[PDB]
Design a protein around this ligand. Structure first.
Ligand SMILES: [Zn+2]
Lengths: 265, 264, 235, 52, 48, 49
DNA sequence: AACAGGGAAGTAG
DNA sequence: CAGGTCGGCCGACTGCGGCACTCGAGCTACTTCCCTGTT
DNA sequence: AATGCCGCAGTCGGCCGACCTG
DNA sequence: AAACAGGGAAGTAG
DNA sequence: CAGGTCGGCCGACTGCGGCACTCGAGCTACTTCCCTGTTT
DNA sequence: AATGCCGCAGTCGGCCGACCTG
């Protein structure tokens, strides 16, 4: 009878429920029959699978990308860099786009923040040039090229773009500023020393104060590479869509989406 | 001390938490302070409000719109007519689009589904043309125009467009069909009779036949237009985001988003 | 290991304590490394700062450099400007505040730009009061650091080299007490036994421990490492 | 029909118009749904008579 | 309609006064300040 | 009734403006610069001041 | 003065 | 009067959508409008 | 050559001091 | 005559 | 053997999302590679 | 002169009967 449903779909592309109620078969059989049909569509609505990793210390993992603030005119090319631990952000409106601009922003941000162990960015031609590669090599800082056409790879610095644009528009409507550099500096000051979180803690002091951690909870964990719920393991950090489990036997901590985290007691 | 926060926000445009934990003010006060600045941007990511009405009796309220099925060639214009109670769908492959073509589609839909009490569409030039207006007047069918640039008022027929496009693409990849009308007819047949619901009820016999009348729950209701939780009342229908409450003191059924209905 | 200190001093020219706390090098070895360099021979942070302007002939047109240094933490900043007008000092104030924060009050000199009403009203809006051995010391330090870094003539603009030198002074140039200018400005470590070399390395911050396994967290390593309790030492 | 279909006394003309299908009732009022009418109407139970 | 509204900027309950409209959980209450009406969430509105 | 609204055509926000009437998800706003009131879905209505 | 092409103008899809 | 209740207050939680390198031109279609031509 | 994110803002609810009251 | 230097086109990615 | 247990089973609920009238052109930056006049 | 809809698919969780075991 199941094979009869098979040619029924092969002729029609019925849905799962109609198969179930018309051929007296279980729901899973109908769902897999729908999945098997080559003409049946590919599921674009995928749930949360990939999570962008974050450093566990200030000055460990950074993200860098360019944007466009058309208000500045010839200073539209705004380069930004956000620390992935404390959300410490920096930017300088530099005209044009070349290795020189990236190097200057790197130096200024380095002075602003410090030495991160490695930096991840997009695949823009400037970020892939040789000169910047030996620049990072001489500075002994690892570089990650990222996946092409994947803004979610730099989702953190894109949310940073959102914050920068919001603050710039706010302070522009607030009044008038002498130089675009002045406006950018004031916005950065507000963001990194005044716009502090609900925990009563500015981004700067987190970036440069002692790291505090209460006894972290022991939570059950689901692993993607085996399809089994293995644990429990220590949970380092958590939030909205990100969790950093780390078993004892793991070489490096594993970052997983929040849908695969379960409380344990 | 609230004044200090006032000029602090006026100068820096801070967040609520900084004001609360720097000037020792209520979180409500901080939110009000960040609200009161005109220079602060307006809230753009607003939650859901407003629900498209759907006639609780079949053949009462319909929706209609056009689309662009580019693979049909000169017949690329598809007119889509869908019910709201049972989501019964009809379509045709009419080359171009004119008041005469829209009228032919209306007649075909009437033959295929029946006579609806009223039809609600977009602000397309065809549906504002007088000829259709006096045609509907002759047939005694009310009309609704909707707000321009706002497909959200036709979201039902938009989702029906999504369904029809998916089905026709599947059938196109399935095999070879003589004419676009033939393929569209096959897809409509599948969607109406074969593509059954999740409750063991084909869309065809939901469109016709007896109405399912379960004992309706006595649920608590929030009145959006008065900001007061008033109830309990009768819950007519429910689904994903939409609900129907028809209190005794109200003359007509009320369409509200589901989140404002709190079960009692 | 000392070769790493060689490139580090070549590119940054830090004091001996910096290298000795960066690579665990001997103090005398650090002194020898420093000597090998050819051209290289308040009570509460963010309370009171010092404002003054100094000139450097190498910039030529950009000698007009505003400099801000803290009384207590001695954290430093500079800006490359074409003049010393009111707007230049205002922009430097804004950028320095973004760099460093907001002090209780500011002590300046008697320059016409400092006394002008623009700076006065700008400070009044920001709720800060307005009023040189330390600043002149830093002027010597930055100019010395500018000359030390000038060895590698690859900097495209004075902003690049200035930022690199300010970075050296702030985060690389580190004191005797074991804290950088940044750490002092912004305010249970367990001894850890390495297994690659078998030597005890630290001290390092502890994350957690359990079932005979300790999640010791190295300072230089970017990620935690799980180590048995046999290779840990209380400190 | 599993559900009853009861007689309805319209108030606009004061005449017993129907009979029509009932939906719900309570508190002296019934949610009577006329076939011609596009929306349900609330009618006092004193004006609703069972039909068979 | 005479209603009670909360002066949530100061945290107190001022009134009574007229209530103009509603919607979006907001009541456009009109205090004795005839300069311009204000808006308050309905949760802080009480009929009186 | 002083209301922030959004020009739904371009998305750029025009306001503040005065509210004539509203009900059940739609708002009828009549700005002074326009000769006719604008009917807008209640998704883009904000209570200015 | 007048209307009937008719081209434009406006508007929504 | 302290048990009982209510309101203030905030941790915790959550629906939403746009950051993605930039914005636009163009066609169809009916109706309102008066020019250019004709009553 | 290495994976979406979170601020704004509304909302639930537990905490707790003041007020009702057997 | 084999080697070499702009110059250009082309491909990829933001 | 019947109380307890695991599994087969499905109602029930949720995260993502493109349906909106159709579409592109073009930007700047860098590297690799090929072409034509220049050198020994 | 009128309001975001809902299928495809994963996933919890109770329901129930074959089956382990008291
Ligand atoms: Zn040196």
């Amino acid at each position: 009878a199941l094979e009869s449903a098979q040619e029924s779909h092969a002729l029609h592309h019925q849905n799962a429920a109609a198969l179930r109620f018309q051929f007296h078969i279980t729901r899973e059989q109908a769902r897999e029959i729908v999945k098997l049909c080559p003409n049946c569509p590919d599921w674009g609505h995928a749930p949360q699978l990939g999570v962008n990793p974050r450093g566990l210390k200030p000055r460990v993992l950074w993200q860098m990308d360019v944007t466009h603030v058309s208000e500045f005119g010839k200073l539209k090319y705004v380069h930004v860099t956000v620390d992935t631990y404390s959300h410490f952000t920096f930017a300088t409106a530099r005209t044009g786009e070349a290795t020189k601009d990236v190097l200057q922003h790197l130096a200024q941000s380095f002075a602003y923040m410090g030495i991160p162990q490695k930096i991840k960015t997009d695949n823009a031609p400037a970020y892939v040039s040789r000169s910047i590669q030996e620049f990072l090599a001489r500075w002994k800082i690892s570089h990650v090229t990222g996946i092409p056409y994947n803004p979610q790879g730099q989702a953190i610095v894109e949310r940073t773009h959102q914050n920068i644009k919001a603050q710039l528009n706010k302070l522009q409507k607030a009044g008038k500023y002498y130089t675009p550099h002045h406006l950018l500096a004031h916005a950065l000051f507000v963001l990194n020393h005044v716009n502090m979180d609900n925990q009563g803690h500015t981004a700067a002091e987190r970036h440069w104060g002692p790291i505090s951690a209460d006894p972290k909870p022991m939570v059950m964990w689901k692993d993607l590479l085996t399809g089994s719920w293995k644990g429990p393991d220590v949970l380092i950090t958590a939030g909205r869509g990100y969790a950093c489990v780390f078993p004892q036997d793991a070489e490096s901590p594993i970052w997983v989406p929040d849908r695969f985290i379960r409380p344990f007691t």
